[PDB]
Design a protein around this ligand. Structure first.
Ligand SMILES: NC(=O)c1ccc[n+]([C@@H]2O[C@H](COP(=O)([O-])OP(=O)(O)OC[C@H]3O[C@@H](n4cnc5c(N)ncnc54)[C@H](O)[C@@H]3O)[C@@H](O)[C@H]2O)c1
Ligand SMILES: NC(=O)c1ccc[n+]([C@@H]2O[C@H](COP(=O)([O-])OP(=O)(O)OC[C@H]3O[C@@H](n4cnc5c(N)ncnc54)[C@H](O)[C@@H]3O)[C@@H](O)[C@H]2O)c1
Ligand SMILES: NC(=O)c1ccc[n+]([C@@H]2O[C@H](COP(=O)([O-])OP(=O)(O)OC[C@H]3O[C@@H](n4cnc5c(N)ncnc54)[C@H](O)[C@@H]3O)[C@@H](O)[C@H]2O)c1
Ligand SMILES: NC(=O)c1ccc[n+]([C@@H]2O[C@H](COP(=O)([O-])OP(=O)(O)OC[C@H]3O[C@@H](n4cnc5c(N)ncnc54)[C@H](O)[C@@H]3O)[C@@H](O)[C@H]2O)c1
Ligand SMILES: O=C(NCc1cccnc1)NC1CCN(c2ncccn2)CC1
Ligand SMILES: O=C(NCc1cccnc1)NC1CCN(c2ncccn2)CC1
Ligand SMILES: O=C(NCc1cccnc1)NC1CCN(c2ncccn2)CC1
Ligand SMILES: O=C(NCc1cccnc1)NC1CCN(c2ncccn2)CC1
Lengths: 268, 268, 268, 268
């Protein structure tokens, strides 16, 4: 009798046990959803990590920059869920920006080849995934992507902020296409989460200046948030994604839900 | 095993069977919530209307302009739910603007005494209700109010648009105070709903010009909405309010959720 | 050969030599404008203060809460500028909120009579002034009001923030009416300025807590602003108001121009 | 005694007599500015077109995708304005999106190679130009770029809307870097202008459906604008760019000024 009882949902973006997608997958399974998982490059690691989920789920390879992977995706998902069955939900939890684009060097020194790779994976792929999966989605379905509020500039995040501004625009166009299938498209703008990569940045992987800036930036959320913010807890973010995958927000599309403790609503 | 199983929720704003609050109350009861209702002026009518809800609920008198009604509210609610029990949710579904403020005459011709009455009932009362009820709310609780997107000016809505801009500001301050109690505060910005008063305006109760403008304004929503908009169906709005009252959006506060078919995200 | 050569402009809001309106008036006169000034309550003080402006200007009494003052305003201005002449510009630099509404006590403890007085003077009066003066304004004319960004909640500003949210909504409706006369209506959202009242608040006139919060709040602007922010210098704000009064922003109306050093565009 | 008397300004983006940059260049020269022009690919055509400007100006070749052109730009500008002299202003009026990205085919059918080329020219190049020219800019200087409001999705504009969302984000980061030189960075969001390319689209160059959608979209501006909108008149847009290049908006940076007749402030 869970929130997502009987729903078939595809979850992308698991790489480690600290991935936001790992927590989305765990909460969705606790709420009765039947999952299909997609992974990039390190498939042996991803299978070993996902063995720790409450229930066993099939794992499919998906590199969003690979045209062949995207062209065969719908057929591979149909084989995993069985003929005559369709998806009720899709979770995009994919992001990447080369070090040159995220504070290892000044904003002006990031080459366009690096920025373009980052925009392909972080923004264009949201449209790529919707194109591939909408023909195998049921009416009343839901597509959810992960965002980080880019309305104002900030230190070190640099070109990844630009990629998120592009993603928010892409989401509004995806909602127009998804609407024809009776499917909603929305993003969850989360507060900062201490994943393995974020902890490494704070530890100085992109230089001391960038590390100090990210640490101070992350600390501002708990101070501003009227209900506080715990960067070591991904469960409130996972619950918000599940709310959008459910039948309980049926009139919301092309939109952004903020799971940030209310920090974006307060100046100080 | 409903979305709101075991929750004690106060619902204000029922006047007829077409009130948005009537639909919020019905959905909340179908989802296992135990309600307390508040009504203004026509208590015999409200009792007769609420006899049609799935379950019987106690009805309390509340005029938000009456200081005595607000001062005794917490004690009257405690008597209705029993000593030692507290509320888990509060629904503000209250609004009013005199005819002079809503298109019966030009924008510049509305006297301040009329505008002030409208702002008292539609915006200040959101803070009044939170002040009265937060001392009897449990941690993890939720306060929800009804909004109509006022970010851009529009024909005929006139000073009620100004009252909604004030309400959105009030909501951000209420979230600061509610946070100290472990309580969230949010608004649902709904698309237009054909209540008795809205149908009367379309029928020309505020003059032909205002009626023609409101009819054309309301018709724009379904055209712009990627998933469409049915002004004769309040159920998607009621479901969204219940989503905010639940434990499934635990990191959202001082915010606005749009239940408008995605119309605010599209230009044409 | 100044920016405003030959223009007839009404400037409201002068009380002391630290008033934002005093600096707007000085810059407008240096740029060739012919002024008419309006003052409230302390007319002997205002005449003595305005004797320090580069040129002598007629001073008229205007209490925005007084219906008689507003009804006679157009006739009194016509007498001052001469029959057959009209205004090219209007500056609204009026604001007030009782101490109960600005941090001397908690947000929930401000009585509605006090909040209503504050909203009348700070927001409704923008519509009152436009109603009185549009019949004596030339096509190509400009109305400008003073704003303080209220999109996010902040400590101590409390109900004055709510009044500014209402003012921004009022400005969008005033633009609809002013457009029929070929007149623009806009607001300037300024960064914090150390006027006599603001210095007194920092000095603890509204209590130590409010003073400490306002001081820290004000200090954040210079840190966030890419070009910095000097709270002791009103000249950049006065120049921005003159830009809107000129013929150089002819396609901007119902809008907000930010003269805050770019602080609102940066998170940290 | 013009608005820009004695200022040295670089203007990019002239291709025909209908280019927005042609009108910016003409108004800047009428206001006393000394110009340097940059052109792409068709240099013989651009020289012939710019012979019609009020004053003769040097023309330099600049393809924003060419690393060599950008590396030599500052030296070539210094040679044109003379040693010991620096620029006071820079105008970015550059945009491009392949037909696949602007309605000749569905949104999902635009290949990433085409979208990436469009984002390089329309958004990344704003950062490229600032990097090349800031070392030869005077304190008090100004950088201005051209925008088209992308906050909401719209028919046919498709991936060019996504490119504008990226440009707005880039502008906020450019303001951080430019601030170190005492230079402002802002965008002008203009209403639709009937350039040669826009007239060809309305005439069906990108298919009948796209043409019909663009014509209806463009027609909405004049209806919504409180002061109206003339798509055949670029002079109000050129005046707004000159206002930002002047000393009259000295506290505005990382921002957007809307020269759209106030259309973005009104729903209907
Ligand atoms: N961590 C935070 O503070 C935070 C906050 C808000 C939003 N987000 C967003 O949440 C999402 C998930 O990030 P995360 O923080 O969990 O980090 P993560 O490293 O755990 O997840 C990112 C995922 O992207 C995948 N990926 C990269 N390139 C790919 C490609 N070519 N094809 C397919 N998959 C590819 C990686 O394999 C990985 O699984 C991202 O969109 C991120 O921007 C993160
Ligand atoms: N109908 C729409 O199109 C629409 C759309 C979005 C939001 N809303 C908002 O939803 C809310 C509910 O409105 P509705 O459309 O259901 O209409 P409604 O007439 O059914 O409800 C408004 C309620 O306000 C109550 N009220 C008025 N003055 C009061 C006072 N002094 N004290 C206490 N209660 C008082 C009335 O008794 C009534 O129950 C309002 O805030 C309205 O602005 C309506
Ligand atoms: N000082 C700041 O930090 C700051 C920043 C942004 C915006 N503002 C705004 O600028 C405007 C001017 O304020 P200021 O800071 O120069 O302070 P101020 O005290 O010098 O000016 C406010 C003016 O309002 C007038 N006023 C009050 N009640 C009135 C009434 N009933 N009728 C007519 N006039 C009345 C006062 O006489 C005074 O001249 C206000 O709208 C204020 O909110 C101030
Ligand atoms: N026309 C409108 O309705 C409208 C409205 C708002 C904003 N804009 C924006 O105004 C700007 C100017 O466009 P326009 O409408 O005057 O059209 P336009 O065709 O006259 O100008 C665009 C310019 O971009 C140049 N360009 C293209 N690729 C280039 C490259 N690789 N290197 C250098 N220059 C390159 C072209 O040569 C041309 O001069 C664009 O950013 C456009 O998006 C246009
Ligand atoms: O989006 C975020 N974090 C949000 C944030 C911003 C500021 C402060 N705290 C948190 N992280 C993603 C994670 C995936 N990516 C990545 N991972 C590995 C290598 C390269 N890139 C891109 C960045
Ligand atoms: O907020 C709305 N409607 C939203 C809307 C706007 C534009 C087009 N369609 C819908 N209605 C409320 C209802 C309660 N009020 C009221 N009721 C009775 C008498 C006076 N006022 C105030 C107005
Ligand atoms: O709007 C402002 N200041 C903006 C601000 C906000 C936060 C930090 N720094 C600056 N001041 C006005 C001034 C006129 N008013 C007033 N004056 C006298 C007595 C009562 N009220 C109302 C408030
Ligand atoms: O940005 C605009 N127009 C704004 C607009 C949007 C919707 C309705 N009316 C106007 N035009 C530019 C012009 C330069 N570009 C271009 N030119 C030639 C070939 C390819 N691309 C890119 C598009």
């Amino acid at each position: 009798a869970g929130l997502l009882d009987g729903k078939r949902i595809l979850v992308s973006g698991i790489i480690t046990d600290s991935s936001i997608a790992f927590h989305i997958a765990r909460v969705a399974q606790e709420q009765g959803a039947q999952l299909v998982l997609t992974g990039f490059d390190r498939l042996r690691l991803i299978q070993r990590i996902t063995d720790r989920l409450p229930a066993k789920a099939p794992l499919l390879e998906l590199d969003v920059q690979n045209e062949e992977h995207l062209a065969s995706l719908a057929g591979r998902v149909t084989e995993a869920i069985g003929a005559g069955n369709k998806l009720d939900g899709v979770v995009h939890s994919i992001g990447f920006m080369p070090q040159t684009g995220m504070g290892i060097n000044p904003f002006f020194d990031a080459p366009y080849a690096d920025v373009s790779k980052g925009i392909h994976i972080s923004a264009y792929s949201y449209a790529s995934m919707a194109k591939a999966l909408l023909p195998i989605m049921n009416p009343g379905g839901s597509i959810v992507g992960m965002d980080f509020d880019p309305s104002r500039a900030m230190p070190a995040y640099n070109w990844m902020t630009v990629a998120k501004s592009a993603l928010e625009s892409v989401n509004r166009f995806v909602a127009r296409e998804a609407g024809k299938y009776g499917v909603r498209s929305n993003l969850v703008a989360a507060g900062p989460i201490r994943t393995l990569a974020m902890s490494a940045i704070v530890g100085g992987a992109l230089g001391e200046e960038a590390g100090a800036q990210i640490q101070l930036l992350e600390e501002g959320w708990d101070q501003r948030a009227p209900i506080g913010w715990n960067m070591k807890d991904a469960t409130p973010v996972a619950k918000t994604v599940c709310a959008l995958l459910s039948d309980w927000l049926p009139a919301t599309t092309g939109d952004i839900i903020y799971a940030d403790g209310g920090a974006h609503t307060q100046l100080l």
